[PDB]
Write an enzyme that holds these catalytic residues in place. Structure first.
Site: not given
Ligand SMILES: NC(=O)c1ccc(CN[C@H]2CNC[C@@H]2N(Cc2ccc(C(F)(F)F)cc2)S(=O)(=O)c2ccc(C(N)=O)cc2)cc1
Ligand SMILES: [Cl-]
Ligand SMILES: [Cl-]
Ligand SMILES: [Cl-]
Lengths: 99, 99
Positions: A25-27
């Site tokens: 998960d690059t996000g």
């Molecule tokens: N702070 C952290 O370290 C952290 C935060 C959140 C997560 C969970 N993983 C993130 C990334 N992928 C989707 C997920 N989310 C993205 C995301 C991206 C960025 C951030 C932030 F910048 F605030 F840190 C937080 C969350 S999500 O929950 O908002 C999401 C889920 C599903 C979908 C979809 N179906 O398109 C879109 C968005 C994991 C770790």
């Protein structure tokens, strides 16, 4: 390997002596794993996104094996809907995005 | 390009004629953009995020550029922490994970 994104990029990982399926998960800034025991000290943290926030326990210096690649780093443990390998560990196995 | 993950993989997108910052997010199934005006009819869509499920608006066949790569596809609009380019469009522009 090269992993396409037609479906969720799930791999098998080994952590704390357990096998688990996790999403590359690059996000995700950090790695987040469903409830499990990890050794060492921890500190509480909040992480969130769409849907809001959850509380997790932050453990540092945890070893995880990802597709045969050992990496050490922070692991957040809490009520995540899916196990997530975040950037903090993806860098250690040399994972890039390419297009 | 090849994008490493020591920092957030943020890129410039162009949508509705305007440049915005968005995150390349392999953990997101879908592409979710902050509130803005898009053409056409929309349909309801429930997405599951880290904190729970929410309702967003789905627009189909929307023109969008990602890091200069032209794409056309489904864009969701809702309260997202950052603009997110998810697997549907990452796949379209030929983005893979590699290690
Ligand atoms: N702070 C952290 O370290 C952290 C935060 C959140 C997560 C969970 N993983 C993130 C990334 N992928 C989707 C997920 N989310 C993205 C995301 C991206 C960025 C951030 C932030 F910048 F605030 F840190 C937080 C969350 S999500 O929950 O908002 C999401 C889920 C599903 C979908 C979809 N179906 O398109 C879109 C968005 C994991 C770790
Ligand atoms: Cl770390
Ligand atoms: Cl590197
Ligand atoms: Cl699409």
């Amino acid at each position: 390997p090269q992993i396409t994104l037609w479906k969720r990029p799930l791999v098998t990982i080994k952590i704390g002596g357990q096998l688990k399926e996790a999403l590359l998960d690059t996000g995700a800034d950090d790695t987040v794993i469903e409830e499990m025991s990890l050794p060492g000290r921890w500190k509480p943290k909040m992480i969130g996104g769409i849907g809001g926030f959850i509380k997790v326990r932050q453990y540092d210096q945890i070893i995880i094996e990802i597709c045969g690649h050992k990496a050490i780093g922070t692991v957040l443990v809490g009520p995540t809907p899916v196990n997530i390998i975040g950037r903090n560990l993806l860098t250690q196995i040399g994972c890039t995005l390419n297009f």
